[PDB]
Amino acid sequence: MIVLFVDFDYFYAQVEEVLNPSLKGKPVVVCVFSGRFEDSGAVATANYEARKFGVKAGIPIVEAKKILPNAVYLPMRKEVYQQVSSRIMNLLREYSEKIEIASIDEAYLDISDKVRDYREAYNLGLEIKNKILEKEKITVTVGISKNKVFAKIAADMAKPNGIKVIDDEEVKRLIRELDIADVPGIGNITAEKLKKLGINKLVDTLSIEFDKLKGMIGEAKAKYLISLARDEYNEPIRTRVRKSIGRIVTMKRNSRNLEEIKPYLFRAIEESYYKLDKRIPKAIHVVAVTEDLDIVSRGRTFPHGISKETAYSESVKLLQKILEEDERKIRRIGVRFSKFI
DNA sequence: GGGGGAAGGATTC
């Protein structure tokens, strides 16, 4: 089996450049402003010029202006990045049939019935890696290996504007030389946990006992790391369909007043329904982020689809159920819809 | 014991 992985480079910031070439060369920073005050939000993306000075996704806009006060701060425009993304996907879908769109900027192509030999694949990369830019002017990275995971790991290493292959021999070298923190699916919390057990390489997962491991990262996660280490990881490429659509907003003031919240919650719902498009959800969750950034949320599932009217109706019950089962003040409130018909 | 889910909390990105 041969998996080819494409990943659009510094995507949001890269699109704002295609749309405004002048920016190419200068530090660009796409961010999300909440509203509580001027320049209050987080950074979503930054091109490499901005990154090499310490600006990366996740940090406070304030903390970034204090580093590159003279950088171009642009507001995020997801609807645009989504359309540009959709065109390229369709552009990718002309190489394989077996295709898995992971996110707005990633995709896995099972280029197996279209190719052989790694060399034959690599070439296919430089190809894809070139039609995209010809037609859309976007630069991407390609990674290719035996399974989904190593193909990604490859692309991570080989970025930016790269292409790279990890044959079966190189995989073996990695299963024992690569930091676990760098395995897809593993994050800060689970990462800073495997240490507490004495694991830093995929290979370690074989030493530790299954029950010990199973109890810090989880049974699913555990089985996942073991499989990669035994080199038994092999998941078919496929589809993936949004199983949930929702929206959350930050209120100008943290509050516990049902009347104050209601308007923000209703804005979330109306926005949510628009995105639902022609999909009927049978479940709904009200979601709230406390001021210490916790997330609490109550939902209800229905034996049939939900109408905006029922949605407006039920959400208020859920918003209360919450306000009761807890004590903290609310900062952000929103809704999520799932179990589509 | 465990299927089959709904409901609640935690993570990754």
Added chain:
DNA sequence: CGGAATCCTTCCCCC
């Protein structure tokens, strides 16, 4: 310090 979506873990009804 923002926001979207998924991912895991527990509780329940019952054969």
